[PDB]
Each structure stands twice: as C-alpha cells, then as structure tokens.
Ligand binder design. Structure first.
Ligand SMILES: NC(=O)c1ccc[n+]([C@@H]2O[C@H](COP(=O)([O-])OP(=O)(O)OC[C@H]3O[C@@H](n4cnc5c(N)ncnc54)[C@H](O)[C@@H]3O)[C@@H](O)[C@H]2O)c1
Ligand SMILES: NC(=O)c1ccc[n+]([C@@H]2O[C@H](COP(=O)([O-])OP(=O)(O)OC[C@H]3O[C@@H](n4cnc5c(N)ncnc54)[C@H](O)[C@@H]3O)[C@@H](O)[C@H]2O)c1
Lengths: 268, 268
C-alpha cells in the first residue's frame, strides 16, 4: 500500500531524534509520502539528524516568528516539490514557552512578554503557516497541529496550557478559511511523550517541584488509560497524525483527535 | 435584605451608561454593596457618568496594560476603602481588540501585534488584576470576569473569540491560586448585549458584512433561547454577576456561568 502514497506533506518541528515530528516524518515516509522539512535554528544539526530518516527530504529554514521566512515559504516549497505540484498535507509540530511561564516560577509572575512570545510561536503560528501554504494545497489537503488537552488546569504547564487553549480556538477559525480551498484542519491531542525537553524537565530542569509534578501527571496518565500509555514510544501518535493526513477521515475538520490512550475519558 | 449587604466590591470597565459594568454596579449598589470603581482613559467622562449611579463611589484610574497602575492598585484601594478593610469582590468587565482582528478584515490578516494587544488586555489582564488584589481580599471573596462562549467558531468576532478561549484557560489557573486565599474565581458568559460598541458595529462600523453577520447571530440567539434573549436589557447579566459575588454559590470556582437565555444548550 502506502497509506500516504504519492502525497506531498511538509513537516515541521524536528529537532532531535526524539521530536515527535521526527517520528511523524519517519512513519509518513514508510507510508509512501514524499516530504519537505522545515527547521528552525540549528540547521546543520537538524540536517545531520534528518539523514537517518528512511529517505531524503529537502529541508527549509523557517523561523515561525520571521515575516520573510513566511512571505517566501510557498516560493521555496515549490522550487523544491517542483513547479506544477502542490502540497497535500502540512504538519505543525511546533511550540515553545519561556522558562518563566512554565515551570516553577508562579503563574502570576510570568511577564506578558514571555507569555506573548509563547502564544506567538505556539498558537498564532498555526494561522500563519496556513495562510502561507493554503494557496498551494490540493483539495482534499489536510493541515494538522499538535495539541495537549488544555481543557482542565494542571500544575507546571502553566501558560503553555493557556497557549494550547488559544491554539484550539485558532484551529476552528483556520478550519473556516481552509474549507473554501477544500482543505481540512485538525489538531491532535497527545499524551505526555519523553521528548528531550520533557526529559530535562522531569529530570529537574524547571525546578524540583515542577519535575515531581510532571512525573506524577505522567503516571496518572497510564493508570487512567484503559489501554495504557507508554511515554517513551511516540509511535501511536505518529500513526494518528498519519491517519489524519490521509483520505480516511474526509468529513472531519476544525476538530481534535485524542491520541492519548483514552485517558481524557476516565475520571480515575 | 441587600444580597450584597456590607460587601466591598471593586468594579471595572465602565465607559458609557450602556457598559455592562455600569449595570453591574447599579444593581450591586441597590443590593447593599459598597464599591470602588476603576476607569481607563476618559476619566472625566467616566466620572460624569458614574454620578447617575444610585450612590457615590471613589474612582481610580487603571490602565490594565500599565505596570505602575498595577503595582500601586492595592495601595490606592485601601486608601479608599480605608485601612483595616478588605475587598470581598472584584469585577473584571473589560476587554478590547484592534479593528484589524475582528471585523471585516480577514482572519489571517490580523497582525500579531494587534492580536497581542488584544490578548494582553482581554485575557492576561484577568491574571494581573488577581495578582494585584488577592492579598487584600477576604476569604469567601469572589473574583468574576465577563466571557462570550468562544467554544465554537463564529463570523466576525475573529481573534476576539481566540482571546476569550485564552481567558477561560487563565480563569482555571487563577482559580488554583485564589483558593489558597479562600477566594473563588469564575466567569460569566453573556448573550450579545447592545452596548455602544456593539451598536456601532451592527450599525456598520466594522464594515457592512460584519454588521449583517452580527445582526444575524443576534437573532439566532433569541430563537434558540428557550426563554428568549433581549439584547437591549443587560439586567439579567448584572443580576447573575451579583449572584456570583454573593455567598450563595460558595462551592463553585474556576467555572463559567451561562447567562445567555439557555441559547448554548439548544442546536436550533
Ligand atoms: N512532548 C509532549 O509530551 C507533548 C504532548 C502533546 C503535544 N505536544 C506538542 O507537540 C509539539 C512538538 O513538541 P515536541 O514535544 O516533539 O518537542 P520538540 O521540542 O522536539 O519540538 C518542538 C519544535 O518547536 C520548534 N520551535 C521553537 N521556536 C520556533 C520557531 N520560532 N520557529 C519554528 N520552530 C520553532 C523547535 O525547533 C522544535 O522542532 C509541541 O507543540 C508540543 O506542544 C507535546
Ligand atoms: N456586549 C456584549 O455583547 C458582550 C457579551 C458577553 C461578554 N462581553 C464582555 O463584557 C465585557 C465588557 O464589555 P462591554 O460590552 O460592556 O463593553 P464596554 O465597551 O462598555 O466596556 C469594556 C471596557 O474595557 C475598557 N478597556 C480597554 N482597554 C483597557 C485598558 N487598557 N485598561 C482598562 N480598561 C480598558 C474600557 O474602558 C471599557 O470600560 C467585555 O469583556 C466583553 O467582552 C460582552
């Protein structure tokens, strides 16, 4: 087969080989997709990493907070997939929040600026990628972003939770605009995954207490999941994003798909 | 009686005599509350207006985006309610979004800056008022903000809907912090009210199309409300905020109370 046979998907947000984008990309490729990657600030590093990928892919630099990068994106993508072709899928796997809006530092103490940097990169950027790529997408195209159920407060993820609730609200508006092009836009809500970043944190980088709390959120997750939750295998999330990028979920947009072991549907 | 007998509530967000804060304030007063008001930029105007209020109240200037105003707030409030006393309620009835993130101008075209100004004043400010006043609140105190169900996209309210979803997420975090002081924090989701601002808009200030859309959202509202919805009487919203400020809803925080005629519970 190739669930994504002959499709053209752009993928963003690869840093290390434990980035969730990294896995989405790998599975996408085993699934016949043909990619184009974007990276942020360590390009040679992302470059080196991305080679272990099952197959080659052009890599474009893109700082989601950069006007030009954005203005030039579609141009650059077409040079690479080559003129005459369009995108079938776009993945927004990116996000960020200053240390101050998140860890240990109390909720009221994060200054708006940091918080705004956060919302800029984490939520607003979904809109900007859309606006930039939509003109080059085929109908039936699919835009997907990564979420973390912000629907109930929790410790430590402070303002980042605020930025995900804002992201979920942007998705519904992006869905309205994308539909005029025949394109879907949805999010995926993942359970906690031991990414590099997370590791450092349960490892005590945002402070001891923050770490202990995450660590506990993490264990509550697998207890509650009727099918369990393994924080060290991003696989089950990759596959979902893949399902969404394909043609099998054709009537769903401005929506959230929970890839979290069923944890959110159980109280305890 | 005096539902709010001998309570001390601070009230913000009065501009004209059609501001929702204006009514909350009036009903609060008929209910025995003793207020302190904050105003923004037209102080003499707010001053003049506030005199028609059923009773006198000190007015303090406060631009929610001003570090000092904020640092000095509690000082100023105590000078006025007078040393030895504390606040029992605080009302956040304020909000704003640049013309560019809202009306007619397409969703993707609002620049982050305007959008950020919006989120600053509209959502983040709930956190900052909290942080500023909590140290002076009595236990059993109640903080309340005004919401507009952002839970499903709609036309024209573009980024302002995004800012309300972010507000609802902040409320849950403010609720976590307030509880350590014995204080509740909730929001109120109102139906559309013919405030000055709104008028101008259904009147075609944000463009014709924006106006026509609101106008229709407005009429869908009363059809759906099993008990109807009158956009020209803010009364039923005042009363609710009042219920929340009192002691009759003592076990509810980080929550949303719908004061919207029951519209949100019906499909059509
Ligand atoms: N790890 C989790 O437990 C978890 C759970 C659910 C959802 N998510 C989301 O998955 C997404 C990917 O996170 P990850 O956990 O794989 O982390 P990750 O740290 O590997 O990747 C996040 C990406 O954001 C990029 N970034 C920061 N600023 C940027 C900018 N200006 N322009 C472009 N890229 C920028 C980084 O290069 C990085 O590739 C995030 O949105 C995260 O919120 C993660
Ligand atoms: N009118 C509606 O149909 C409707 C519906 C539901 C919820 N709400 C909310 O009710 C709240 C009050 O709105 P209103 O409709 O009564 O409008 P209004 O325009 O009379 O008042 C909003 C207030 O925001 C203040 N403002 C702007 N920037 C400020 C700043 N930097 N510092 C302090 N104040 C600032 C203004 O002075 C004004 O008093 C808003 O949050 C609005 O979103 C309104």
């Amino acid at each position: 087969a190739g669930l994504l046979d002959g499709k053209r998907i752009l993928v963003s947000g690869i840093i290390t080989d434990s980035s969730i984008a990294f896995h989405i990309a790998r599975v996408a490729q085993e699934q016949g997709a043909q990619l184009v990657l974007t990276g942020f600030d360590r390009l040679r590093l992302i470059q080196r990493i991305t080679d272990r990928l099952p197959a080659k892919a052009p890599l474009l630099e893109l700082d989601v907070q950069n006007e030009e990068h954005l203005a030039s994106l579609a141009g650059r993508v077409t040079e690479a997939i080559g003129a005459g072709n369009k995108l079938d899928g776009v993945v927004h796997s990116i996000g960020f929040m200053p240390q101050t809006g998140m860890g240990i530092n109390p909720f009221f103490d994060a200054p708006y600026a940091d918080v705004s940097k956060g919302i800029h990169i984490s939520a607003y950027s979904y809109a900007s990628m859309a606006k930039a790529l939509l003109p080059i997408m085929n109908p039936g195209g699919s835009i997907v972003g990564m979420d973390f159920d912000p629907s109930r407060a929790m410790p430590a993820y402070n303002w980042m939770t605020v930025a995900k609730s804002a992201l979920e609200s942007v998705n519904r508006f992006v869905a309205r605009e994308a539909g005029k092009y025949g394109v879907r836009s949805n999010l995926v809500a993942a359970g906690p995954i031991r990414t590099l970043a997370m590791s450092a944190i349960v490892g005590g980088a945002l402070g001891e207490e923050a770490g202990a709390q995450i660590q506990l959120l993490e264990e509550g997750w697998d207890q509650r999941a009727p099918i369990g939750w393994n924080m060290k295998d991003a696989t089950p999330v990759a596959k979902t994003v893949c399902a969404l990028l394909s043609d099998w979920l054709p009537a769903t947009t401005g929506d959230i798909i929970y890839a979290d072991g069923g944890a959110h549907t159980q109280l305890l």
